[PDB]
Amino acid sequence: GSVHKHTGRNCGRKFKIGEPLYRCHECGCDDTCVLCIHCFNPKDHVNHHVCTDICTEFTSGICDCGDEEAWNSPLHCKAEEQ
Ligand SMILES: [Zn+2]
Ligand SMILES: [Zn+2]
Ligand SMILES: [Zn+2]
């Protein structure tokens, strides 16, 4: 897979139509806190309650990975791995 890391800053990537927005009940500050396909690390959320929403004309936004206000726990962005 190809990767473009956002290290030392937030992701902020705008979801493309059709993509999942991931939320985690445990990690999210609230229900508007979301991660993109590039960032969501399944390892961070094994014992967690995760839901996806799907990007449409009316459901969109930007990825909160790297924005510390959005998360209760340290996230390990998927893009940073190898
Ligand atoms: Zn992202
Ligand atoms: Zn990320
Ligand atoms: Zn989580």
Side-chain angles (χ1 to χ4, degrees), residues 5-51:
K5 306 168 177 65
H6 60 83
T7 155
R9 50 153 289 180
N10 67 313
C11 182
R13 172 186 186 281
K14 217 182 167 304
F15 298 94
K16 314 195 166 318
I17 282 201
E19 292 190 348
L21 299 63
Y22 297 80
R23 64 191 193 271
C24 177
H25 184 68
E26 287 76 10
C27 298
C29 171
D30 54 49
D31 279 348
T32 71
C33 299
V34 291
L35 299 159
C36 72
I37 47 170
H38 296 18
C39 284
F40 179 83
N41 188 330
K43 295 178 265 180
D44 289 329
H45 318 289
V46 191
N47 286 71
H48 293 189
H49 297 68
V50 173
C51 295

Side-chain angles (χ1 to χ4, degrees), residues 2 4 9 18 30 34 39 44 47 54 56 62 68 75 77 79:
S2 70
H4 331 104
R9 50 153 289 180
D30 54 49
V34 291
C39 284
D44 289 329
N47 286 71
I54 299 293
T56 68
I62 55 131
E68 75 178 308
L75 301 179
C77 177

